[PDB]
Design an enzyme around this catalytic site. Structure first.
Site, mmCIF file in Angstrom:
data_model
loop_
_atom_site.group_PDB
_atom_site.id
_atom_site.type_symbol
_atom_site.label_atom_id
_atom_site.label_comp_id
_atom_site.label_asym_id
_atom_site.label_seq_id
_atom_site.Cartn_x
_atom_site.Cartn_y
_atom_site.Cartn_z
ATOM 1 C CB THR A 23 -0.958 9.703 1.375
ATOM 2 O OG1 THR A 23 -0.025 8.782 0.947
ATOM 3 C CG2 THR A 23 -0.161 10.921 1.733
ATOM 4 C CB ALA A 25 5.102 4.578 -3.192
HETATM 5 C C1 LIG Z 1 -1.384 6.890 1.436
HETATM 6 C C2 LIG Z 1 -0.559 6.156 2.449
HETATM 7 C C3 LIG Z 1 -2.177 5.820 0.773
HETATM 8 O O1 LIG Z 1 -2.611 6.257 -0.463
HETATM 9 C C4 LIG Z 1 -0.441 7.582 0.428
HETATM 10 O O2 LIG Z 1 -1.145 7.863 -0.670
HETATM 11 C C5 LIG Z 1 0.770 6.754 -0.039
HETATM 12 C C6 LIG Z 1 1.892 7.652 -0.572
HETATM 13 C C7 LIG Z 1 3.308 7.307 -0.128
HETATM 14 C C8 LIG Z 1 3.545 5.841 -0.174
HETATM 15 C C9 LIG Z 1 4.284 7.913 -1.088
HETATM 16 N N1 LIG Z 1 0.483 5.945 -1.212
HETATM 17 C C10 LIG Z 1 0.668 4.646 -1.254
HETATM 18 O O3 LIG Z 1 0.989 3.994 -0.296
HETATM 19 C C11 LIG Z 1 0.456 3.978 -2.584
HETATM 20 C C12 LIG Z 1 -1.006 3.822 -2.865
HETATM 21 C C13 LIG Z 1 -1.114 3.507 -4.171
HETATM 22 C C14 LIG Z 1 -0.982 2.210 -4.557
HETATM 23 C C15 LIG Z 1 -1.079 1.871 -5.876
HETATM 24 C C16 LIG Z 1 -1.290 2.868 -6.784
HETATM 25 C C17 LIG Z 1 -1.421 4.173 -6.402
HETATM 26 C C18 LIG Z 1 -1.330 4.490 -5.084
HETATM 27 N N2 LIG Z 1 1.051 2.658 -2.541
HETATM 28 C C19 LIG Z 1 1.927 2.217 -3.428
HETATM 29 O O4 LIG Z 1 2.389 2.861 -4.340
HETATM 30 C C20 LIG Z 1 2.396 0.843 -3.164
HETATM 31 C C21 LIG Z 1 3.547 0.996 -2.229
HETATM 32 C C22 LIG Z 1 4.170 -0.336 -1.937
HETATM 33 C C23 LIG Z 1 3.415 -1.055 -0.856
HETATM 34 C C24 LIG Z 1 5.515 -0.035 -1.380
HETATM 35 N N3 LIG Z 1 2.879 0.130 -4.318
HETATM 36 C C25 LIG Z 1 2.106 -0.719 -4.950
HETATM 37 O O5 LIG Z 1 0.968 -0.938 -4.615
HETATM 38 C C26 LIG Z 1 2.725 -1.556 -6.028
HETATM 39 C C27 LIG Z 1 2.995 -0.876 -7.361
HETATM 40 C C28 LIG Z 1 1.875 0.015 -7.813
HETATM 41 C C29 LIG Z 1 1.948 0.279 -9.177
HETATM 42 C C30 LIG Z 1 1.688 1.553 -9.632
HETATM 43 C C31 LIG Z 1 1.720 1.847 -10.975
HETATM 44 C C32 LIG Z 1 2.022 0.871 -11.886
HETATM 45 C C33 LIG Z 1 2.274 -0.400 -11.449
HETATM 46 C C34 LIG Z 1 2.236 -0.701 -10.106
HETATM 47 N N4 LIG Z 1 1.830 -2.656 -6.241
HETATM 48 C C35 LIG Z 1 2.026 -3.796 -5.620
HETATM 49 O O6 LIG Z 1 2.945 -4.018 -4.862
HETATM 50 C C36 LIG Z 1 1.023 -4.847 -5.940
HETATM 51 N N5 LIG Z 1 1.030 -5.919 -4.957
HETATM 52 C C37 LIG Z 1 1.156 -5.573 -3.562
HETATM 53 C C38 LIG Z 1 0.666 -6.733 -2.726
HETATM 54 O O7 LIG Z 1 1.336 -7.937 -3.124
HETATM 55 C C39 LIG Z 1 1.261 -8.259 -4.515
HETATM 56 C C40 LIG Z 1 1.805 -7.095 -5.314
#
Ligand SMILES: *[C@@](C)(CO)[C@](*)(O)[C@H](CC(C)C)NC(=O)[C@H](Cc1ccccc1)NC(=O)[C@H](CC(C)C)NC(=O)[C@H](CCc1ccccc1)NC(=O)CN1CCOCC1
Ligand SMILES: *[C@@](C)(CO)[C@](*)(O)[C@H](CC(C)C)NC(=O)[C@H](Cc1ccccc1)NC(=O)[C@H](CC(C)C)NC(=O)[C@H](CCc1ccccc1)NC(=O)CN1CCOCC1
Ligand SMILES: [Cl-]
Ligand SMILES: [Cl-]
Ligand SMILES: [Mg+2]
Ligand SMILES: [Mg+2]
Ligand SMILES: [Mg+2]
EC number: 3.4.25.1
Lengths: 212, 195, 222, 206, 204, 222, 233, 195, 206
Positions: free
Chosen positions: A1, A49
């Site tokens: 982000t 997210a």
């Molecule tokens: C910028 C873009 C990057 O940091 C922003 O910060 C964005 C904010 C927007 C999306 C609101 N953040 C993210 O994109 C965020 C980064 C992140 C990831 C993990 C932890 C903290 C921050 N991404 C996510 O939350 C992703 C979004 C998915 C792609 C829609 N989600 C995950 O990675 C999930 C679940 C995370 C999780 C958090 C807490 C407890 C348990 C799980 N994880 C997965 O999908 C794992 N994985 C992905 C690849 O294939 C196998 C499964």
């Protein structure tokens, strides 16, 4: 982000990117990181997210319940503090949230509150939040003045996200613009970086590091 | 050691390097020059692990000066940068590697062009219009993406550099006690005393 | 120490058209280097013209689908047999997933159907409940292989109009059910070739206003 | 699985069914590490008139369990009359299985009914129950698996069974440092309950 | 601290009718920070082309090393090295550092000047040769590239058509990887002419 | 990998699948796991791909020099001894798991070598991730006094068991027959039961689809 | 959090034209020690279902007690307990599957792998798997532990897909199962020669075979094998 | 959160607290007031873990304000400090303790004396003529040992305080963006706007 | 001590002196975890004409050692003539002791001299040497300490010694999962060298 929002002469500008990542995997380029709480309140989303989306939509419900009970729109301060007190209860549990509660009311005027998942709550004129916050700060701070026009302020916000979208690997997709006035928030479109970068490069003459 | 910047403009290369030397909770010195002249038209700034930085810089300086005496000729910035990269590329697989990051700003007299090389402690070399090491880059790169133009003058470059330092002084956590700025051009190396 | 999670492999794929929507998924189930089943369906009709799949750890996937199917049932009881709209289902699923935020369902969930204007809809979820409507989404083991191909062929990304100097983009248009099934079949045969956890069989569920149709195709069994 | 520094009951224990009933047998040694805390321990313990058990593992754990089982079977007797040996084993299992993480108790249950005659149930660390013709357990039992399998026969006499236990435990003691001292035995038959003891001078030179 | 994914980058190679193509992105970064958008990963020694992904210091080191070795080869042999032979040289050199390896993912591409046959090959970091009729992929978006190539590719493509296929494979794969992109270069290689095209892609 | 070796009447046969993996990703769909140490001594390899190739080539090189030095055709036991002592010296770190077979003036032979340097003798052997699937077939169908055609059938069937049931193995079946008094015949792609089906659609792009910034002729000549 | 103590190895099974077959050896291992030899690991429920269990034996005995209690509970206030409202294989499985997943969710699992084999009231074959993680799946052939690695390949040569089920007789199916048990005895270090086998047919009903032995083994070729390479004597 | 100082002089207590709020490599704010008024003649500054600091300060503020309304009376600084210490003393043995360090500057109207209390997150209370929390003390304590006198005026105290801030700005590694100064005396609490 | 994933030679091995010389005995099972990598292994190996050894522990380590010892004794023979069994054991010890850190090899050395008749030397993990009338080793030997101690006698006949080894290893195999397959034996006497084999169908039902 990368997300930012700054206060100025003509209200508040709010700008965000639209990328979502899972490690180095670009999972989405079309994520809505601005939540529309009500016609006068906005919330930005950075970090986990699900955490951001779930709790900021929950915040909207709590704001609706306030105006039903009190027959009056909730203050930006009170709205931000509901969210900060909530995440504080979960402190240490591993929530990951970097948010900004932006809006206008009569008593407060245009107001921005930074709220994060370790319980920090700060009122302020300028904030940049996210993995590419520093890249946005570099452009925003060096071009910021209080006396910016609505047209120039909208562009600077857009240009600051573009700067971060370019340099930060974990930011990109498209830019979402908002302008908050005394009459409420106004959406100023989705801007794809795919076309916006070259349009900005040509017209502005910037980005000379890149092969034209 | 922390902040080192570099900007290549039309006719010169400008290097800016922080003056603070900090150990623990004390700033031991606020007037430290984090650079060495390798040759009359080549300057190297450095930052990294304590001791390693100066030991490495002076070792390179001695080698380039030895070459200059032997051949009665000045090596090109490109040649010097390649020599420096190889030394770091050896180092990274040693028993104890040099933990030093460098910028090499030089003026090629044969091409009549300024050149800026960024090399990290792994031996990762890149030629750039503007460069930075450490946390500095997280602010300065995006800033320069916006404000930098390739045909700028040395004076325009110094104003562009002031814009970077101001941003760093506003948003960086640590007090780095300002910067020493040096210019490399066709007439050699000189220091800006009032910055 | 006991590890409550496992990886059952497989991959899933959702595409939305103008008046239809498909949700595909291979029928292979695995643990480590062994095949558990060559035909174990993981795409389910949940009622109200909603199809669902929760790929990853199958025990969590089954538990989730089971709970959502039950959520649909009680929605009818509590709200006078009202049809659960795809958008309402999506929000309900978010709460199911986030309810276990601190002991998550290790699955990538995708649902498909028609929105309230009759147009094709696909929603996708992360393990803890973040969701987003899209025209296109691949999930599971071979998502990284299939997804960029979908960006190129469904949303026409990086494709420009010939002779326009890379200035005019290829215009977006809806795809026919025939053209979509071609892309699904090619996506899964490609994924089968290069991913070990993908193969055996392909099961597609198509959703139109008329109902939920099924199609099955063989995949390589190595 | 033992707690640090707690008394160790590592043993040479066995129970053997035979024509007239069942005989329990055990060594006498307790250790903390290499030091023999008690050299004359009684590892054969009464939970009911003609239902006894052999204890191995943790001294504290096995004692606490045996005391609870004795309480349950005394309360069982007051309401429902004499309990079966299977019933006693079930009560042991219930305690060992439900508390399998906090306990180290390898128990052999042996009893005499009039209907069911001599029975032996073994209960290892996991808390599982295994009904067998004879059973061996404790640190020293490993060394006599070969010997006991080759020499055991069903429907033995009292004197034969006593010799089988004596020779077996003698070898277990000889090779296991955690086993030693006297060899105690308990005979369970229709006749009643008989206690036997055998000293080193006798069994060592077998 | 995973050497193969600090700097980022990708390379892909394909065969066609009497031709070969090799392409790469231009990004060099330090984890999240994008540093350079001019860092090319494809080099050539005579008519033999070599692409290298992975740790950037090793990419540079190996280029310099193979330039060194192919120059001595040519002086002693009195002819240019061929793709099949060069492939073996790369494998030897990488396996020489078996227990202290270069953290790279090299890709050879070229046309044998004697037989005229199109040739491509790939390697792991310790020198294992991966030969292929169709395509070779490498880098931080290798999964993505495998998916694109396996679906888009068809045999016996003309140079002009092959250009479109490899370019679309690289671009759409790079856009799904955070550490890849920031520009791209494509080499089309015919028997006695070589065209080099820079692609326009999204710069995020 | 799956690799096998089977002895018969007048010689020995070895076989292998042709899958090469990179985690869960199939890197090479048709790689050659049968290696020539000398003309009539061949080697099937499983484990670390570079190690099996490197160790087989090194010993093959030294065997050739030994054959020239002694003016004799090389023996299988020489290759066996040289391989095991090399692998032992590296205490398992060179991850080569080999099935060594061949004919020489002493007769026909079949051995296996493990990474730590232990060797085994047998009439039928199997190594690799699909060795259990293969050994199940070998244990079920092997007998004494096999013919040439029966041994090839048994060996390929054992590889097939790995191809279908083991996710680590797949694609094709390579075979090498080493009969006494005859030249060894290397049967590359002896079976090809995993041919990719026709794609539903051609993804040939219209010329000009890709946006271009610069063009330039590259100089390959001197 | 558990660790298994007394354990049981592979359970193997397959479908055939009129019903299902399931088998498992009679061993209770204590690590490398082959401690208990009279352990029955196939447990019938009614006259139409057999539950085969591997893994921890203390947990197996707990599951026995649950199934035993399930039969009792189903009989309560049920006049059709031996007819229309009798326990089906699908009912018994779903119950176990619920328990297994609930226990894994409480971080205190029943350390087992279970295969429920049987025939439904309408004649349909039932064969489904469940384990300590609550993971479930069904297939024409199912096996646990080693069985998954060695038996399934052999059993899939007989019934490779659904259409091969009507073509497979009970004679052919049992032969494959018995062969698989031999291979497991050759190759599984925690297996025994003695085993039990059960057939549930839609016509002939439940046939439970005890005290079977692996036989027709090939060991003769061993005498020819000398040394580990060079050695001739 | 980092620098909080306190100096008790003849007729007043002076508290100085840094304005910077830093998260990661970014200074998010440079005008932060790290203090809360507990009562008209009692002021508390604070520093420590993010979130905990403000949450704790406001919780104390609410409790003291509740007392003032209930009794229509202002608690003495000594009484307030004892209440605060007990809350921290409870906290340290909780599931999740408040990681907050505070200074309580007050004017006792009954005694007509200024009072300065230093309390750490463990609940360690001391009354002092001058106090500091964090790394600040390592410079300021020795400085005040030398220059402090008990009979100083408020103006002399502010000059003494300027001497501390200058030293910190010279030798501290981090940029703390200056301080907000507040005075507590017989007339209540007021802020010095130009420092 | 075993390196991760390496073939384990865990075994039931024994060597027994008797009137006419000495007999070595072993099972044929080799395991990689619980998979049996080889069911027909030869764990009895020649280092000299009438000096053999039983191997246990690591397959790779024992093979590498045995190959070196065979080399040393072949070179010894060329210079100094036939080596004693003690000499062979000394060469084994020297390798096992000096590399005790890097090796897992439990070796039993057994040979026949004309002067010294049958001799048995056992060499455990530490590298110590112990000359004994008979010796047992390997994972499966734990289960037959009792049996072997009770049943061994000095100056047995060939047929008695073969029965003693057969019955002992049969029990070790029955109780040890790491042991199994056929029972190989090697007879060392003045007459020469004789190889024997015994299959499951025979020895299981003993
Ligand atoms: C910028 C873009 C990057 O940091 C922003 O910060 C964005 C904010 C927007 C999306 C609101 N953040 C993210 O994109 C965020 C980064 C992140 C990831 C993990 C932890 C903290 C921050 N991404 C996510 O939350 C992703 C979004 C998915 C792609 C829609 N989600 C995950 O990675 C999930 C679940 C995370 C999780 C958090 C807490 C407890 C348990 C799980 N994880 C997965 O999908 C794992 N994985 C992905 C690849 O294939 C196998 C499964
Ligand atoms: C069956 C198919 C699987 O066991 C067979 O055994 C085959 C054997 C044949 C091909 C020789 N085995 C493999 O294919 C083998 C499996 C494997 C993987 C990893 C470790 C051990 C075994 N595959 C390989 O060896 C591949 C060959 C590639 C496809 C060319 N190599 C890798 O995966 C390398 C492993 C390198 C290595 C380093 C240190 C010790 C052992 C191996 N891995 C990578 O390249 C991954 N990574 C990519 C980014 O750059 C850093 C490394
Ligand atoms: Cl006791
Ligand atoms: Cl061996
Ligand atoms: Mg397979
Ligand atoms: Mg003793
Ligand atoms: Mg970016």
């Amino acid at each position: 982000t990368t997300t930012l929002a700054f206060r100025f002469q003509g209200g508040i500008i709010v700008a965000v990117d639209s990328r979502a990542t899972a490690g180095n995997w670009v999972a989405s380029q079309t994520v809505k990181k601005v939540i529309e709480i009500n016609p006068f309140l906005l919330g930005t989303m950075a970090g986990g997210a699900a955490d951001c989306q779930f709790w900021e939509t929950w915040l909207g419900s709590q704001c609706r319940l306030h105006e039903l009970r009190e027959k009056e729109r909730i203050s930006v301060a009170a709205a931000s503090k509901i969210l900060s007190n909530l995440v504080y209860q979960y402190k240490g549990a591993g929530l990951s949230m970097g948010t900004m509660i932006c809006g206008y009311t009569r008593k407060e005027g245009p107001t921005i509150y930074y709220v994060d998942s370790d319980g920090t709550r700060l009122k302020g004129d300028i904030f940049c939040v996210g993995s590419g916050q520093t890249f946005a700060y570099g452009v925003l701070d060096s071009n910021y003045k209080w006396d910016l026009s609505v047209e120039d302020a909208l562009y600077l916000g857009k240009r600051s996200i573009l700067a971060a979208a370019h340099r930060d690997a974990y930011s990109g997709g498209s830019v979402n613009l908002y302008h908050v006035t005394e009459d409420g928030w106004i959406y100023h479109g989705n801007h794809d970086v795919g076309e916006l970068f070259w349009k900005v490069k040509e017209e502005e003459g910037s980005f000379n590091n890149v092969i034209g | 050691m922390d902040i080192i910047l570099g900007i290549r403009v039309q006719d010169s290369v400008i290097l800016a390097s922080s003056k603070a030397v900090t150990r623990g909770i004390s700033v031991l010195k606020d007037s430290d020059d984090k650079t060495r002249q390798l040759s009359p038209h080549t300057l190297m700034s450095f930052a990294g692990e304590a001791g390693d930085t100066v030991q490495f810089a002076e070792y390179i300086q001695a080698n380039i000066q030895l070459y200059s005496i032997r051949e009665d000729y000045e090596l090109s910035p490109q040649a010097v940068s390649s020599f420096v990269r190889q030394e770091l590329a050896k180092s990274i697989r040693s028993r104890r590697p040099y933990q030093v990051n460098v910028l090499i700003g030089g003026y090629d007299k044969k091409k009549n062009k300024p050149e800026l090389y960024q090399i990290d402690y792994l031996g990762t070399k890149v030629e750039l219009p503007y460069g930075a090491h450490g946390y500095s880059g997280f602010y300065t790169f995006s800033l320069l993406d916006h404000h930098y133009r390739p045909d700028m003058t040395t004076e325009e470059g110094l104003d562009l550099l002031k814009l970077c330092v101001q941003e760093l002084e506003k948003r960086m956590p640590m007090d780095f006690k300002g910067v020493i700025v040096k210019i490399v051009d066709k007439d050699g190396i000189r220091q800006v005393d009032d910055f | 120490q006991f590890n409550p999670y496992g990886d059952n492999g497989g991959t899933i794929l959702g595409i939305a058209g103008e008046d239809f929507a498909v949700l595909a998924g291979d029928t292979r189930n695995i643990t480590d280097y062994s095949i558990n089943s060559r035909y174990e369906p993981k795409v389910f009709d949940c009622g109200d013209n909603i199809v669902m799949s929760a790929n990853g750890f199958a025990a969590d996937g089954d538990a989730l689908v089971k709970r959502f199917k039950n959520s649909v049932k009680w929605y009818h009881f509590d709200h006078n047999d009202k049809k659960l709209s795809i958008n309402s289902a999506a929000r309900n699923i978010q709460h199911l997933l986030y309810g276990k935020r601190f002991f998550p369902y290790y699955v990538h969930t995708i649902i498909a159907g028609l929105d309230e204007d009759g147009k094709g809809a696909v929603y996708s979820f992360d393990p803890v409940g973040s969701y987003e409507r899209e025209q296109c989404r691949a999930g599971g083991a071979a998502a990284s292989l299939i997804m960029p191909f979908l960006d190129n062929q469904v949303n026409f990304k990086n494709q420009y109009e010939p002779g326009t100097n890379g200035k005019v983009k290829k215009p977006l248009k809806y795809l026919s059910v025939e053209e979509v099934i071609k892309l699904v079949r090619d996506s899964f045969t490609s994924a089968t070739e290069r991913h070990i956890q993908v193969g055996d069989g392909l099961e597609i569920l198509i959703v139109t206003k008329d109902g939920v149709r099924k199609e099955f195709y063989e995949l390589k069994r190595d | 699985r033992l707690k640090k520094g707690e008394v160790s009951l590592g043993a040479s224990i066995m129970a053997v069914t035979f024509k007239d009933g069942v005989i329990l047998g055990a060594d006498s040694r307790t250790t903390t590490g290499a030091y023999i805390a008690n050299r004359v321990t009684d590892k054969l313990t009464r939970v009911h008139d003609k239902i006894w058990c052999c204890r191995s593992g943790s001294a504290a754990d096995t004692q606490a369990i045996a005391d609870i089982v004795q309480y349950h079977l005394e309360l069982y007797t007051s309401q429902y009359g004499t309990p079966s040996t299977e019933t006693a084993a079930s009560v042991f299992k219930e305690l060992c299985y439900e508390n399998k993480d906090n306990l180290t108790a390898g128990i052999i249950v042996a009893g005499y009914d009039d209907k069911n005659k001599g029975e032996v149930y073994t209960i290892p660390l996991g808390g599982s129950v295994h009904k067998l013709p004879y059973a061996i357990a404790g640190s020293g039992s490993t060394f006599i698996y070969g010997y006991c399998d080759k020499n055991f026969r069903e429907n033995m006499s009292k004197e034969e069974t006593v010799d089988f236990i004596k020779h077996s435990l003698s070898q277990a003691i000889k090779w296991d440092g955690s086993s030693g001292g006297v060899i105690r035995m308990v005979v369970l038959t229709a006749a009643g309950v008989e206690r036997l003891i055998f000293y080193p001078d006798e069994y060592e030179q077998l | 601290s995973d050497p193969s994914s600090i700097n980022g980058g990708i390379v892909v190679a394909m065969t066609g009718k009497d031709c070969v193509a090799i392409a790469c992105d231009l990004r060099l970064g330090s984890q999240s920070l994008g540093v350079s958008n001019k860092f090319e990963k494809i080099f050539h020694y005579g008519h033999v082309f070599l692409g290298i992904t992975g740790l950037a210091t090793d990419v540079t080191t190996l280029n310099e090393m193979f330039r060194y070795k192919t120059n001595l080869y040519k002086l002693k042999e009195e002819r240019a090295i061929e793709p099949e032979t060069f492939t073996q040289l790369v494998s030897s050199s990488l396996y020489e550092r078996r227990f202290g390896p270069y953290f790279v993912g090299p890709v050879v591409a070229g046309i044998n000047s004697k037989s005229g046959k199109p040739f491509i090959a790939g390697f792991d970091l310790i020198g294992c040769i991966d030969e292929a009729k169709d395509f070779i992929v490498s880098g931080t978006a290798s999964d993505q590239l495998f998916g694109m190539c396996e679906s888009l590719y068809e045999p016996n493509l003309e140079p002009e058509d092959l250009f479109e296929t490899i370019s679309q494979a690289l671009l759409n794969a790079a856009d799904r990887d955070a550490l890849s992109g920031w520009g791209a270069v494509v080499y089309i290689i015919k028997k006695d002419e070589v065209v080099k095209r820079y692609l326009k892609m999204r710069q995020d | 990998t799956t690799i096998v070796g089977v002895k018969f009447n007048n010689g020995v046969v070895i076989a292998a699948d042709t899958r090469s993996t990179q985690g869960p990703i199939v890197a090479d769909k048709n790689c050659a796991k049968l290696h020539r140490i000398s003309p009539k001594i061949w080697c099937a390899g499983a484990g670390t791909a570079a190690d099996t190739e490197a160790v087989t080539q090194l010993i093959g090189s030294n065997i050739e020099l030994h054959s020239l030095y002694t003016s004799r055709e090389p023996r299988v036991v020489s290759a066996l001894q040289m391989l095991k002592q090399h692998l032992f010296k590296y205490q398992g770190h060179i991850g080569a798991y080999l099935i060594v077979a061949g004919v020489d003036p002493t007769g026909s032979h079949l051995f296996s070598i493990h990474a730590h340097g232990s060797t085994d003798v047998g009439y039928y052997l199997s190594l690799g991730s699909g060795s259990l699937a293969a050994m199940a077939v070998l244990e079920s169908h092997w007998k004494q006094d096999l013919t040439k055609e029966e041994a090839i059938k048994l060996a390929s069937d054992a590889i097939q068991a790995g191809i279908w049931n083991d996710l680590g193995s797949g694609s094709n079946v390579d075979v090498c027959v080493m009969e006494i008094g005859k030249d060894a015949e290397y049967l590359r792609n002896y079976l090809t039961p995993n041919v990719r089906e026709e794609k539903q659609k051609s993804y040939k792009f219209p010329r000009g689809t890709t946006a271009v910034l610069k063009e330039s002729i590259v100089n390959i000549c001197d | 959090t558990q660790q298994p103590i007394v354990t049981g190895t592979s359970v193997i099974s397959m479908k055939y034209d009129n019903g299902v077959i399931i088998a498992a050896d009679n061993l209770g291992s204590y690590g490398s020690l082959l401690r208990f030899n009279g352990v029955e690991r196939l447990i019938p429920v009614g006259d139409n279902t057999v539950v085969g269990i591997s893994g921890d034996i203390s947990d197996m005995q707990h599951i026995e007690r649950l199934l035993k209690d399930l039969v009792t509970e189903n009989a309560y206030d049920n006049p059709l307990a031996d007819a229309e409202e009798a326990l089906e294989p699908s009912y018994i499985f779903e119950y176990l599957a619920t328990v297994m997943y609930q226990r894994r969710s409480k971080m205190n699992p029943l350390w087992n792998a279970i295969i429920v084999a049987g025939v439904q009231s309408n004649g349909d074959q039932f064969l489904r798997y469940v384990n300590l993680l609550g993971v479930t799946y069904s297939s024409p052939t199912l096996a646990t532990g080693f069985g998954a690695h060695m038996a399934n390949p052999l059993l899939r040569k007989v019934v490779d897909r659904e259409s091969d089920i009507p073509k497979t007789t009970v004679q052919v199916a049992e032969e494959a199962i018995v062969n698989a048990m031999r291979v497991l005895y050759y190759r599984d270090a925690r297996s025994s020669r003695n085993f039990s086998l059960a057939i549930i047919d839609k016509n002939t009903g439940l046939t439970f075979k005890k005290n079977l032995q692996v036989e027709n083994m090939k060991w003769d070729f061993a005498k020819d094998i000398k040394g580990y390479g060079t050695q001739k004597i």
